[PDB]
Amino acid sequence: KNNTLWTGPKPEANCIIEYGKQNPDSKLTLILVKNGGIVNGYVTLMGASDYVNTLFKNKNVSINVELYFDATGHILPDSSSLKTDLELKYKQTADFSARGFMPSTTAYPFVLPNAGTHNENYIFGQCYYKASDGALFPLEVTVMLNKRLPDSRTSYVMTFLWSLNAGLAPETTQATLITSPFTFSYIREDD
Amino acid sequence: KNNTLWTGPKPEANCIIEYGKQNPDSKLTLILVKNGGIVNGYVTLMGASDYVNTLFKNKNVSINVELYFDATGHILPDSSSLKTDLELKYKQTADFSARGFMPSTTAYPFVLPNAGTHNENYIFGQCYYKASDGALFPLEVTVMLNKRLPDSRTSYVMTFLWSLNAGLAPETTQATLITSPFTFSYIREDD
Amino acid sequence: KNNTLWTGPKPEANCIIEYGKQNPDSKLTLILVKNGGIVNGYVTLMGASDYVNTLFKNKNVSINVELYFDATGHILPDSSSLKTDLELKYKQTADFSARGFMPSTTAYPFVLPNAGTHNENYIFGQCYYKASDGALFPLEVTVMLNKRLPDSRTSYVMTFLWSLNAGLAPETTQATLITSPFTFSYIREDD
């Protein structure tokens, strides 16, 4: 056992949404659990800055989070949106190899674009935002696994995009941004 | 392994939907399986009374199921919609402690009874109702974890809401209400 | 430790979509993982023929994949769309019984042919098709478990239907068909 790799259940601000900001402005909860040959994931984002908490005063919203991992499955905090590495739920040890939680590069390879679409690397789904007035808006989610390699330090990529394209803005005031839990599963690398 | 807590796979009527009814009018199927630090859930409701089975003669419908558990994860039947406790897929010395199946009070705390606060305690999704003529209608699902205590004897809360908001009612006659299976995952309490 | 039954992560053409074709024209990725009392599934289909890769030149499309298994959970290749049996992620043989990965016939019974509706044998959901120009199209998914046999040699049934009813066709030329990953869970038979 050490079948759960996660941010903790109620993390402190650990992720930067607003490009260029130097400190965290949001709280990413991300949990990756092994289950046989797949990983089951759970992700939710909570805003923690006035900028993130006023994004939903606009009708068109896109939130992006990119995670870059090294060869042993550890976050590269300089290029990732998440600035703190994930940790095993059972283990005080940070000494561990997390390759087994990573997205398979056999199912979801890195590719060089070379005229021709490569859409095997995406998961699509939906999650929701509940506004201040009670209205519920669907958020379209895209997860991309591996596919584009940005540098030589990276071995695995997991990116998230939440998009809202609404008839009218959900809010007219600042309100804590919370994306409802989005679950997904993917084929995992060997341990 | 002490890892599945459920109603059974095809339960007899075990749940009360209609306000003020004294005996079960529906069959709730609920399965909670441990997977690392999360529980994976599966839930479906089947009507077993004329009242439940004529709800979809209206175009706007809300079905509420509330589950209140004690400190060792057992159902409190007086206040809960479900009138029979859940059971382990494998049998009892003292019946048993089901606390590790419950929603985490760290991830999903109990909070003051203020309106519209703490929307991090909800999971939103969709499942479907297939009408007698074949039309498929989406049902918006809300699951509430903990958040509001109903009384001083409860330790954990899990509530389900299925909502239909159609342009035209699905049915014009009585028909067996069946919600298609809804899956969800949540951060679990320690064993 | 033999909890994954699958096609492998990047299968050769192994499925026949087009009516009356004798050899595979598509690549079905199917992974069934035990988790306590349920199976967690992941399915995606990739086209592998000009026929399959031109279906999305029409706005209305139905793709069907039917899997029929014998009493030990192995594919009957003659009748099924999948022509190669599933394999354990850790084996090598037919030294494997796969009944524990099958859909429970208590939760999803077989019923008398042609007598009633039996919507409790269906799981409905959505996945997507990303077109060559980038637009995302929702695909409605229906999974049927057990319910009706194709012949008297079959013990378990799992069928998938992906449907598109767009306002306009996704494509005007041939393009690799890919159904984004669809996850679902169901109550499993005993091992």
UniProtKB/Swiss-Prot annotation, chains A, B, C:
Homotrimer. Interacts with host receptor CD46. Interacts (via N-terminal tail region) with pentons. Forms spikes that protrude from each vertex of the icosahedral capsid. Interacts with host receptor CD46 to provide virion initial attachment to target cell. Fiber proteins are shed during virus entry, when virus is still at the cell surface. Heparan sulfate might also play a role in virus binding. Its main location: virion. Keywords: Capsid protein, Host nucleus, Host-virus interaction, Late protein, Repeat, Viral attachment to host adhesion receptor, Viral attachment to host cell, Virion, Virus entry into host cell. The keyword Glycoprotein does not apply. This is Fiber protein. It comes from Human adenovirus B serotype 3 (HAdV-3). It is found in: Virion; Host nucleus. The chain holds residues 129 to 319 of 319 of the full protein.
